[PDB]
A paper describes a structure:
Using our established protocol for producing highly purified and concentrated enzyme, NanH was screened in sitting-drop crystallisation trials, with conditions containing protein in 0.1 M HEPES pH 6.0, 7% w/v PEG 6000 producing robust crystals.
The NanH sialidase of Tannerella forsythia, one of the bacteria associated with severe periodontal disease plays a role in virulence. The C-terminal catalytic domain is preceded by a 160 amino acid N-terminal domain that is a CBM that our laboratory discovered is capable of binding various sialoglycans and non-sialylated derivatives but has no catalytic activity itself. The NanH catalytic domain (residues 197–552) folds into a characteristic 6-bladed β-propeller catalytic domain, with each blade being composed of 3–4 antiparallel β-strands.
Numbering used by the authors:
A (entry chain B), B (entry chain A): 34 to 552
């Protein structure tokens, strides 16, 4: 007689067989009670054309000790099961009904007798594989009938659901996992997404890891098969498991359209984490190496790797590597990659590395802040670089300014205040007024918008050079748990792309109108 | 400088492509040093004709922080990787050499330049797939040559290596894992091994779990395809993930050769552990159910399950189930299964359940001991049952006697003293004097022979009804880490079979001459 409905703010993947539209908790069932039918309604303006099917599933009951406020006993659609990331695990969910032609009103039926107490049902939505990434569903459970009486419906279920595409799922092309996203838009409008290909498992370097790249010439609707942008196989006769390269950062040289990918090659180091096992020195046998590849053909083919360690690594550092995600071209044509180093006393520092000669030579000056790691840089105003930093103190992003490419650093007003975090990679980009439909300079930022865990992946916009991030100028994309790393790139004048580790896929692409951010 | 050699006491699987014969640590290498050649010698009476090939692998180096005493950076041959349990992970080991015709002396070569410090090599043995399970190798590294100088060899490498067979590997027939072994020998000499088929992962009930059975009519050399002995699929319209059955115990009714399998069916309980979520009551919706199948055709086909719960479960118990492993026929024809119950206050007790009518009706009297769980029972003398118990107090097995089928219990002299454990399932069987080649009553026991972790799987024999377990009357089978559950059954007059979770496979069978136990 009382039913609870959840409409979870998570991406509907156009390439998935099942996506969670509604979770339903019937908390106080009498044994034998039957959910005869439930009615969904879609909003007037919904493009029901590109909805392929809607399914009602039963998932049984809850454990006696797990309490009465959960919407599921288990993950319905796994983002980690290498054998199935695309459909509901059939061992957790039994299909009751299915409609393959969707109208604005829709009724699903069961004859399943319920157990005493908590019973779980959910609604799966399957989209046409060619569904527009910019499409939205406004769906409501309007009627639930139990023992031929309409039941009282409760819960927040007014979420506007967005589409996305699982560019990489766990198990794709034999790889256990994919991590550490980077995204740029080439001068030809081509989306380039980079990531770790983590073949054996999901652990950080050292392991068998290559740098993968997914390419889209249609604003993310389709992605060309995975290219290996960088790999070290059995270099020097050491196993591929002791020759990993990863934590990639990608940038487009906007003057030439030359694309650059920088990454950390770990050589040796047993089967342990490079973060604590990379040591002082310069040789591949001694310390992690800073490796770069380039594409001169819009990311279709990739150069052999060049070793730039000798140019920029201090011998006393335990570890120098890029900040994962992306770098930038500045207005004066300087290429800038965020970097991070562990000093002789094992203290991490964020900073920047830049080339003034199209990527021929690279320079690092002074660190921005102590006990920071992963950082992303934007040119917030001409000749003014904002470094936005993961901070081991917890709670909030560190923000510093350089006007001299990291020779000197100033604390920004927004430092350790404006942007909450849980100690996790975050994306920051600048959008020039002339390059977007708002006609105003923007900063766009994405991270897990929480001080604990990795969830509530959110795009935030600032109109005042990242002094203020108004709540209204934010879109929630993924309220469920994931590995939390993300990277932003403007797709065109009207839309921002996010390439991120989500609750629905290891590498998830979504496109968001900047008019949804700034209303 | 010196080199260190390990000959690990782990099973050589006749069905594996790779098995670790030797691990080698070269601790203090100069960059460029080359292990030119390595000589192994086999004992004069070794059956080298059933050795198919020997391989030398390089595995690179060690992590800076992991110290100097390890024999490997990583597991070389995985017992968990659903994509490969049978050959070395090629990302961790590079083959240097291979000999396919094995003599008493054997030389393996490399041209691999070593890194400064620690370098790992290992020797893989592949056996003929028809290799005798009773065969042994006595192998030693006699020469290691580096830079054309013989190096000083150190280490304990005098192990007599035994054969085994991986009856179930992780991933077999689509199942993530296999756990909880039981083994009997039918009156026809047929080996019947039962186990959890844990489809989704390796967690305990509640989950998608069936009872599997492997059958061998040739004393374990070959195993028939896996049969599902018990399964509840989508009973009552609940998902298979909320209809698991497992923790099996198997016995042969020696009077009739009727084989019986008892198991715990969990219905509902969300995706949580039944151990803490099974609750008082009697119905499948309320509490775990005690379910039984039988085979009248030597384990080829299995009856539909009968529900025994009403006969033996007190309503106030949170959980009644069998002790995993096996039950017995007593000399007077009584069938006995070890059982365990959680009382109304969540305190576990071990006991016995018996049938005097060929398995028609079952009875439980009094528990043996507070805060015990998994137990195995043997008829040490006519009408005298020894219950050997997992004890939550830690350190050692509890041992009690009943002469009245558990109405009353006496502490045995060996109680909480003679048999070390880490709080883990253990196997105990009795062998009558007339039924074995020693012509003496035996007790045989197997468990991880440690107070910490699960390793050193060992068969122990007692000649004095389990009063004493002399060190000499013990065989070490697996000194490396596993899940630790095991079950014993006499194969014939001369050999005991062990079906166990090992470091080399989820379900491992080995055969041991009792003349190796009692010398």
């Amino acid at each position: 007689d009382s039913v609870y409905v959840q409409n979870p703010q998570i991406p509907i993947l156009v390439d998935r067989t099942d996506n969670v539209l509604f979770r339903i908790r019937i908390p106080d069932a009498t044994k034998g009670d039957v959910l005869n039918r439930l009615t969904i309604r879609f909003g007037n303006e919904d493009k029901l054309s590109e909805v392929k099917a809607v399914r009602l599933f039963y998932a049984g009951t809850e454990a006696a000790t797990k309490g009465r406020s959960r919407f599921a006993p288990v993950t319905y659609v796994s983002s980690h099961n290498i054998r199935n990331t695309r459909s509901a695990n059939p061992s957790y969910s039994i299909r009751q009904d299915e409609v393959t032609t969707v109208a604005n009103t829709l009724t699903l039926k069961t004859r399943q007798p319920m157990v005493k107490g908590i019973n779980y049902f959910w609604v799966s939505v399957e989209m046409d594989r060619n569904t527009s990434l910019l499409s939205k569903l406004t769906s409501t459970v309007t009627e639930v009938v139990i023992n031929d009486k309409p039941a009282v419906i409760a819960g927040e279920q007014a979420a506007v659901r967005r589409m996305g595409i699982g560019v990489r799922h766990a198990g794709d092309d034999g790889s256990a996992s994919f991590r550490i996203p980077g995204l740029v838009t080439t001068n030809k409008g081509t989306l380039l997404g980079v990531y770790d290909v983590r073949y054996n498992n999901s652990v950080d370097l050292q392991e068998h890891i290559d740098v993968g790249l997914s390419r889209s010439t249609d604003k993310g609707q389709t992605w060309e098969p995975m290219r290996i942008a960088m790999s070290f196989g059995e270099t020097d006769g050491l196993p591929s498991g002791q020759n990993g390269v990863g934590d990639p950062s990608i940038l487009v040289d906007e003057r030439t359209n030359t694309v650059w990918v920088v990454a950390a090659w770990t050589h040796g180091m047993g089967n342990a984490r490079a973060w604590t096992n990379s040591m002082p020195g310069m040789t591949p046998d001694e310390t992690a190496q800073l490796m770069m590849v380039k594409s001169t053909d819009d990311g279709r083919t990739w150069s052999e790797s060049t070793n730039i360690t000798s140019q920029v690594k201090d011998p006393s550092w335990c570890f120098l590597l890029q900040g994962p995600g992306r770098g930038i071209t500045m207005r004066d044509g300087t290429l800038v990659f965020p970097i991070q180093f562990i000093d002789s006393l094992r203290v991490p520092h964020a900073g920047i590395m830049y080339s003034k000669d199209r990527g021929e030579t690279w320079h690092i000056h002074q660190p921005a802040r102590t006990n920071t790691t992963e950082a992303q840089v934007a040119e917030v105003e001409p000749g003014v670089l904002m470094l936005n930093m993961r901070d081991n103190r917890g709670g909030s992003r560190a923000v510093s300014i350089t006007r001299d490419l990291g020779k000197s650093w100033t604390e920004h007003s927004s430092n350790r205040s404006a942007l909450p975090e849980s100690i996790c990679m975050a994306s920051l980009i600048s959008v020039k007024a002339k390059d977007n439909i708002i006609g105003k300079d923007l900063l766009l930022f994405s991270n897990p918008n929480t001080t604990e865990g990795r969830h509530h992946i959110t795009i935030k916009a600032s109109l005042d050079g990242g002094v203020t991030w108004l709540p209204a100028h934010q879109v929630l994309l993924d309220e469920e748990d994931g590995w939390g790393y993300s990277c932003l790139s403007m797709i065109d004048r009207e839309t921002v792309g996010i390439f991120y580790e989500s609750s629905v896929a290891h590498m998830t692409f979504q496109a968001v109108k900047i008019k949804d951010l700034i209303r």
